[PDB]
Amino acid sequence: EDPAVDLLKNYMQ
């Protein structure tokens, strides 16, 4: 997990 990985899912959902 990285700040990116959290944001990817933040933009997806």
Attribute tags:
mainly alpha; elongated; p6-gag
Beta strand %: under 5%
Shape: elongated
How many strand elements?
0
Radius of gyration: 6 Å
- Describe the largest sheet: none
**What level of helicity do the residues show?**
over 70%
Task: Write down the secondary-structure element order.
Answer: H
Question: Distance between the terminal alpha carbons, to the nearest Å?
Answer: 17 Å
The structural class is mainly alpha
Number of helices, counting only DSSP H or I runs of 4 residues or more: 1
PDB class: viral protein
Keywords: siv, p6, viral protein
Assembly: monomeric
Entry title: Solution structures of HIV-1 and SIVmac p6 and their interaction with accessory proteins Vpr and Vpx in the presence of DPC micelles
Notes on the protein architecture:
With 13 residues, this protein is an all-alpha fold. The chain is 77% helix and 0% strand. It contains one helix and no strands. The longest helix has 10 residues, at 3-12.
Topology:
Blueprint: H1 3-12
Brief description of this entry?
This protein has 1 helix and no strands.
